[PDB]
Amino acid sequence: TALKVLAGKKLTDLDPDEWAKAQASAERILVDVGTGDARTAYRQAIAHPEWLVVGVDPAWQRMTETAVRAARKPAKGGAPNLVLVSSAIETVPAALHGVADEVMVLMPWGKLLRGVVLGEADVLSGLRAVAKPGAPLEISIGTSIWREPIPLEIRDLPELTPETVVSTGLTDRLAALGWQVADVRLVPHTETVLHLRAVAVDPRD
Numbered sequence: 167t168a169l170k171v172l173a174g175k176k177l178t179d180l181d182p183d184e185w186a187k188a189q190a191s192a193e194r195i196l197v198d199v200g201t202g203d204a205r206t207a208y209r210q211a212i213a214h215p216e217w218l219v220v221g222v223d224p225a226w227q228r229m230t231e232t233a234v235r236a237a238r239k240p241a242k243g244g245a246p247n248l249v250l251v252s253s254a255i256e257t258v259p260a261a262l263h264g265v266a267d268e269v270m271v272l273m274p275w276g277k278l279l280r281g282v283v284l285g286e287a288d289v290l291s292g293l294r295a296v297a298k299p300g301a302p303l304e305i306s307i308g309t310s311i312w313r314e315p316i317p318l319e320i321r322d323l324p325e326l327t328p329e330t331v332v333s334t335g336l337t338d339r340l341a342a343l344g345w346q347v348a349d350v351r352l353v354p355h356t357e358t359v360l361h362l363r364a365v366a367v368d369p370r371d
């Protein structure tokens with residue numbers, strides 16, 4: 167099955183051979199999950215034209231402004247190495263399986279945020295399914311989302327700190343789904359951000 171990608175304002179099917187040729191031509195494939203307006207993904211594409219930068223978000227309309235920009239000629243802000251895909255991470259199409267050298271989840275919200283905080287299987291499986299073995303997962307959550315008014319998707323959950331990553335069982339759920347936690351830290355810029363890094367391996371018990 168072909169991927170559903172933005173070309174400017176319209177959803178299209180990506181030729182499976184063009185997708186394959188694009189991956190092989192790249193020095194690294196970065197999959198940015200929940201890319202939002204995709205401006206961060208576009209910046210990365212522009213700074214590393216040797217990377218294939220794949221932004222994944224179900225809310226595809228929000229990405230269209232960046233897509234229009236990425237599709238212009240090179241001299242006018244074009245980024246042909248940026249591929250934006252309409253999909254939710256938990257139902258990620260087969261053509262995205264095993265592609266990524268690096269998976270980033272930067273300031274998620276909604277299902278993606280609750281999923282990573284709880285370690286929901288469907289979200290963590292989807293994230294794992296897009297990674298090559300050995301790829302890093304890099305998650306950043308701003309801890310100010312836990313100050314009032316707290317958003318609905320994490321209202322009922324205690325604030326995620328290095329200590330609760332452990333005591334809620336989140337490193338164990340990660341391990342059961344093929345993610346080995348390599349590092350967690352809180353970085354004070356000034357909003358404090360929680361960073362979690364894991365590496366794609368075989369599932370454990």
Ligand SMILES: C[S@@+](CC[C@H](N)C(=O)[O-])C[C@H]1O[C@@H](n2cnc3c(N)ncnc32)[C@H](O)[C@@H]1O
Binds near residue numbers: 279
């Ligand atoms: C504001 S954005 C973050 C933008 C970007 N990551 C950044 O640099 O700040 C949060 C995104 O996570 C996305 N999201 C929520 N649930 C998701 C899911 N299940 N799969 C993929 N993305 C999802 C939302 O649609 C939203 O666009």
